Amino acid sequence: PQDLSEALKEATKEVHTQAENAEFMRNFQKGQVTRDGFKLVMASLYHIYVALEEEIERNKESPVFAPVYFPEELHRKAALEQDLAFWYGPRWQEVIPYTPAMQRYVKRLHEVGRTEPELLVAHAYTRYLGDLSGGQVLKKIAQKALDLPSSGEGLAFFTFPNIASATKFKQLYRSRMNSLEMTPAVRQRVIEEAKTAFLLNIQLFEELQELLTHD
């Protein structure tokens, strides 16, 4: 439907559902997550955001991405750095895993950011706004299921400090994205890449599940 944000939601409803029904995520959402599994998602998110934010910076001035460029409100890399230092210790950077499923997610981000910046919006929208909207619920599940100490660290990723109202921010983001000048042909590629984003998360979930069950 007219608005890109609406068309995107309709065409990805199927894969979005498959993403949430993916075993690993399904369990996490049901409160079934382990420290090992949670550490894997956090490490995964770090690699994803590092690559995504790297590509955003390279394209922040392009007419195709500038409208959805909100560095202070959304950057997550720094937050994940604080979090990984807690979950993996002081030497996290040389200990966190970087699996094949994480690698191809990163690869795709770099591909899009370097040659087709017009599609970066598909990843940024689903990743940022998706994480922003589901964070508080996932955070509580994490706290309950993992029983961490009153360390004051480990879940910074789940709080977007520079966004007062998640609802008002999403309204603004969709507005910028919905008023983005794009061809019905370019528009189709973007919707298709939104699909790619969800599919990349599904293959990641499938791998993390496999890793945990066979270690």
Q: Residue 97 sits in a domain of what CATH number?
A: 1.20.910.10
Resolution in A for the shown PDB structure?
2.1
Give me the number of domains the chain comprises: 1
Could you give the CA distance from residue 68 to residue 104 in angstroms, rounded to a whole number? 24
**Can you give the residue range of the structural domain that contains 103?**
1-215
Query: CA geometry: angle at 55 spanning 50 and 61, to 5°?
Result: 135
Could you give the CA distance from residue 55 to residue 187 in angstroms, rounded to a whole number? 20
Concatenated DSSP letters for the chain?
--SHHHHHHHHHHHHHHHHHHSHHHHHHHTT---HHHHHHHHHHHHHHHHHHHHHHHHHTTSTTTGGG--HHHH--HHHHHHHHHHHS-TTGGGTS---HHHHHHHHHHHHHHHH-GGGHHHHHIIIIIHHHHHHHHHHHHHHHHH---S-S-S-GGG--TT-S-HHHHHHHHHHHHHT----HHHHHHHHHHHHHHHHHHHHHHHHHHHHHHT-
Sign of dihedral through CA atoms 19, 2, 121, 103? positive
Decide: 14 and 189 in contact? Cβ < 8 Å: no
State the structure-solving technique: X-ray
Residue numbers belonging to the annotated binding site for heme b:
9, 16, 125, 174
Residue numbers belonging to the annotated binding site:
9, 16, 125, 174
